Design an enzyme around this catalytic site. Sequence first.
Site, PDB file in Angstrom:
ATOM      1  N   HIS A  89       0.789  -1.303  -0.206  1.00 24.63           N
ATOM      2  CA  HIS A  89      -0.172  -0.080   0.097  1.00 24.63           C
ATOM      3  C   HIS A  89       0.847   1.173  -0.088  1.00 24.63           C
ATOM      4  CE1 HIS A  89      -3.592  -2.330   0.474  1.00 24.63           C
ATOM      5  NE2 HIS A  89      -2.851  -2.965   1.773  1.00 24.63           N
TER       6      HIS A  89
ATOM      7  N   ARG B 273      -0.335   7.611 -13.036  1.00 22.12           N
ATOM      8  CA  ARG B 273      -1.082   6.517 -12.092  1.00 22.12           C
ATOM      9  C   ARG B 273      -2.219   6.044 -13.073  1.00 22.12           C
ATOM     10  NH1 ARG B 273      -1.536  11.368  -7.759  1.00 22.12           N
ATOM     11  NH2 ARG B 273      -3.171  10.324  -7.059  1.00 22.12           N
ATOM     12  N   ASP B 274      -1.602   5.521 -13.932  1.00 22.25           N
ATOM     13  CA  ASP B 274      -2.611   5.169 -14.958  1.00 22.25           C
ATOM     14  C   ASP B 274      -3.158   3.565 -14.910  1.00 22.25           C
ATOM     15  OD1 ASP B 274      -0.137   4.445 -16.166  1.00 22.25           O
ATOM     16  OD2 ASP B 274      -0.931   4.925 -18.145  1.00 22.25           O
TER      17      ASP B 274
ATOM     18  N   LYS C  83      -5.324  -9.959  -7.025  1.00 24.19           N
ATOM     19  CA  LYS C  83      -5.979  -9.297  -5.852  1.00 24.19           C
ATOM     20  C   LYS C  83      -6.923  -8.432  -6.464  1.00 24.19           C
ATOM     21  CE  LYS C  83      -5.043  -7.045  -1.541  1.00 24.19           C
ATOM     22  NZ  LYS C  83      -5.643  -5.690  -1.439  1.00 24.19           N
TER      23      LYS C  83
ATOM     24  N   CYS D 125      -6.109   0.446  -7.639  1.00 25.85           N
ATOM     25  CA  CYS D 125      -6.182  -0.417  -8.516  1.00 25.85           C
ATOM     26  C   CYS D 125      -7.253  -1.564  -8.381  1.00 25.85           C
ATOM     27  CB  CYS D 125      -4.780  -1.379  -8.781  1.00 25.85           C
ATOM     28  SG  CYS D 125      -3.250   0.075  -8.821  1.00 25.85           S
TER      29      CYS D 125
ATOM     30  N   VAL E 295      -7.009   8.502   4.587  1.00 25.70           N
ATOM     31  CA  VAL E 295      -7.084   7.175   4.755  1.00 25.70           C
ATOM     32  C   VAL E 295      -7.446   6.355   6.143  1.00 25.70           C
ATOM     33  CG1 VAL E 295      -5.705   6.751   2.644  1.00 25.70           C
ATOM     34  CG2 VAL E 295      -4.668   6.965   4.888  1.00 25.70           C
TER      35      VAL E 295
ATOM     36  N   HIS F  83      -2.440  -2.714   8.106  1.00 31.38           N
ATOM     37  CA  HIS F  83      -3.659  -2.696   7.271  1.00 31.38           C
ATOM     38  C   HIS F  83      -4.292  -1.531   6.874  1.00 31.38           C
ATOM     39  CE1 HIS F  83      -7.600  -4.691   6.598  1.00 31.38           C
ATOM     40  NE2 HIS F  83      -8.205  -3.430   7.271  1.00 31.38           N
TER      41      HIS F  83
END
EC number: 3.1.27.-
Length: 120
Positions: free
Chosen positions: A12, A20-21, A39, A80, A102, A113
Amino acid sequence: DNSRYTHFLTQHYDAKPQGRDDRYCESIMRRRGLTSPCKDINTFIHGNKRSIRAICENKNGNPHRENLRISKSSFQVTTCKLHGGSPWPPCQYRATAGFRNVVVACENGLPVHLDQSIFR
């Protein structure tokens, strides 16, 4: 024990992304070993490590729900998100750049986590 913090950073944290495509997601998901099985959704947080660590202190977090923490400051992020029918590679991903606080779980003042619910 830091194995879960280092694992958090692997899953993460990406410090310096340019684009950031879709292709970024596809690439970095492979670099970090999240492609067998594919994932389903994974979010990377950008910027410095220290801002993320600080979510565990009052310095940059409030408690949240059951035993989680939510940041005060907003982070550049990239989610993603797996597409195509299969959970098995090749893993293709649609990227969603965002800017937002976040939610993490902390253990020993270290994040271990990321709560993915906020990025669906």
